[PDB]
Design an enzyme around this catalytic site. Structure first.
Site, PDB file in Angstrom:
ATOM      1  N   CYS A 252       6.289   5.432  -2.060  1.00  0.00           N
ATOM      2  CA  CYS A 252       7.647   5.565  -1.562  1.00  0.00           C
ATOM      3  C   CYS A 252       8.614   5.696  -2.726  1.00  0.00           C
ATOM      4  O   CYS A 252       8.342   5.192  -3.817  1.00  0.00           O
ATOM      5  CB  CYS A 252       8.030   4.340  -0.733  1.00  0.00           C
ATOM      6  SG  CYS A 252       7.214   4.232   0.856  1.00  0.00           S
TER       7      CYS A 252
ATOM      8  N   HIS B  55       2.117   1.215  -3.254  1.00  0.00           N
ATOM      9  CA  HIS B  55       3.434   1.023  -2.681  1.00  0.00           C
ATOM     10  C   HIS B  55       4.386   1.292  -3.836  1.00  0.00           C
ATOM     11  O   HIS B  55       3.984   1.223  -5.001  1.00  0.00           O
ATOM     12  CB  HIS B  55       3.623  -0.424  -2.215  1.00  0.00           C
ATOM     13  CG  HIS B  55       2.854  -0.780  -0.977  1.00  0.00           C
ATOM     14  ND1 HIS B  55       2.892  -0.019   0.170  1.00  0.00           N
ATOM     15  CD2 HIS B  55       2.075  -1.853  -0.692  1.00  0.00           C
ATOM     16  CE1 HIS B  55       2.173  -0.607   1.111  1.00  0.00           C
ATOM     17  NE2 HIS B  55       1.667  -1.721   0.613  1.00  0.00           N
ATOM     18  N   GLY B  56       5.642   1.596  -3.526  1.00  0.00           N
ATOM     19  CA  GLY B  56       6.601   1.841  -4.583  1.00  0.00           C
ATOM     20  C   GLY B  56       8.012   2.098  -4.105  1.00  0.00           C
ATOM     21  O   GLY B  56       8.294   2.087  -2.908  1.00  0.00           O
TER      22      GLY B  56
ATOM     23  N   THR C  41       1.420  -5.419   2.438  1.00  0.00           N
ATOM     24  CA  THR C  41       0.222  -5.218   3.244  1.00  0.00           C
ATOM     25  C   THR C  41      -0.747  -4.267   2.553  1.00  0.00           C
ATOM     26  O   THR C  41      -0.389  -3.589   1.587  1.00  0.00           O
ATOM     27  CB  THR C  41       0.587  -4.642   4.626  1.00  0.00           C
ATOM     28  OG1 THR C  41       1.210  -3.363   4.460  1.00  0.00           O
ATOM     29  CG2 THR C  41       1.556  -5.570   5.346  1.00  0.00           C
ATOM     30  N   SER C  42      -1.979  -4.218   3.047  1.00  0.00           N
ATOM     31  CA  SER C  42      -2.976  -3.339   2.462  1.00  0.00           C
ATOM     32  C   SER C  42      -2.712  -1.900   2.903  1.00  0.00           C
ATOM     33  O   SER C  42      -2.240  -1.649   4.016  1.00  0.00           O
ATOM     34  CB  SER C  42      -4.384  -3.781   2.872  1.00  0.00           C
ATOM     35  OG  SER C  42      -4.520  -3.797   4.280  1.00  0.00           O
TER      36      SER C  42
END
EC number: 3.4.22.56
Lengths: 103, 146, 103, 146
Positions: D135, D93-94, D34-35
């Site tokens: 993350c 993200h990660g 997601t954005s």
């Protein structure tokens, strides 16, 4: 301004907060020890603590340890593979305040 | 009184705190691991160093994975109310996130969870230090000339 | 005293030296972001830099960020699972000297 | 001259250095990601903040894993002789040791190796900073009351 994630009535801190991990080497690397004089990290750590514990904040002490280990040490070995290797300590801080051993 | 900042940890409690040193030199032959010569020099150096910082130093030699867990659990359950901080030094063989008992590995996470803010209340808000002399992988740094 | 691993003729430093990793969260944890105000870490980081960049050594700046994020923030969510969660930034230093943005 | 200590990095080079900001907000639908709303606020805040520190800020939005690698490689091959340091901010993200491109993950190690002391000589001995908003796992901190 206002939000849904700040200024909580009941104050709490992360359970993982206030931890400091002073690793001898970088993530994924070997750590070196002299069979006679001891490990590069501990030698350097103790030496810097004896000299700056009553003068510098902990992180700054650990930074001297980083420089000491990184510059003054290089492995020796009959096996070319482990010869002439270097090491860099790894300071991992999750402390929420400065740390002085003296007061 | 005057302006109170609080940018540094309160280190003027009656006691500086415990300094637990786990010195693992001799491993069980069944692990195939070798002895870490020179480690006693590290342990004696740490004891002396932290002794001068006024820490209650406790040294433990050649502990098994179970003894390590029992030691950490026992200590974490002590009353640190009068102590300013907690120090634990681990000198042994290891890998990323892992520390070796004399007979087997121990996840660092398992050792440190005992002292988590919610499991060791007398240390909550207090600096909990873990000094770790051990491998974190098998990579070698070739360095660069300066 | 003398050893086989110190005081090398040709001076070298680890290739992994002089790196600083300012992680937003502790190893193995989620990282929180406010869909409107931004992530807890960046908000705190910028705020502390604007206030201390010309007064404190970098590690000490990052330590304020740790306290700010850890104390002034708590997640909000309609899903109980992600509600009321906390976060602690993770400072990973392999620098060999102190870092001041001013001179 | 007088006593020269050298306890702090030389930060008086002609330039403070580059501040590369990779702001990933919109991901390819094929990733199912997601954005990250609110990230532009982070990016604009970082630009302004580092601008006042005299950093040459370069912002990049929604980059693919390949573009990320190409950007980092290109920048690492620049001449940083006159620069005091290097800053790279990753907003995305990660997971542990991983940062997500708009179409796939990228190992942090791959990004940072370009700047290793021996691969980017003009930065050798200079502070190389990586600020990472992402993350590092799926654990949740329940915290403890103070």
């Amino acid at each position: 301004a206002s939000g849904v994630d700040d200024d909580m009535a009941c104050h709490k801190i992360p359970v993982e907060a206030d931890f400091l991990y002073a690793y001898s080497t970088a993530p994924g690397y070997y750590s070196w020890r002299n069979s006679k004089d001891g490990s590069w990290f501990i030698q350097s750590l103790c030496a810097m603590l004896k000299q700056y514990a009553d003068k510098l904040e902990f992180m700054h002490i650990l930074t001297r340890v980083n420089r000491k280990v990184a510059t003054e040490f290089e492995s020796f070995s009959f096996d070319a593979t482990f010869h002439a290797k270097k090491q860099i300590p790894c300071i991992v801080s999750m402390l929420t305040k400065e740390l002085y051993f003296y007061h | 009184s005057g302006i109170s900042l609080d940018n540094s940890y309160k280190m003027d409690y009656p006691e500086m705190g415990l300094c637990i040193i786990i010195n693992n030199k001799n491993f069980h032959k069944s692990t195939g691991m070798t002895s870490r010569s020179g480690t006693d020099v590290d342990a004696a150096n740490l004891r002396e160093t932290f002794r001068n910082l006024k820490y209650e130093v406790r040294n433990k030699n050649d502990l098994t994975r179970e003894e390590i867990v029992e030691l950490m659990r026992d200590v974490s359950k002590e009353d640190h109310s009068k102590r300013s901080s907690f120090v634990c030094v681990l000198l042994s063989h290891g890998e990323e996130g892992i520390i070796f008992g004399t007979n087997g590995p121990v996840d660092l996470k398992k050792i440190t969870n005992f002292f988590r803010g919610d499991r060791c209340r007398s240390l909550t808000g207090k600096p909990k230090l873990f000094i770790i002399q051990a491998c974190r992988g098998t990579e070698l740094d070739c360095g660069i000339e300066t």
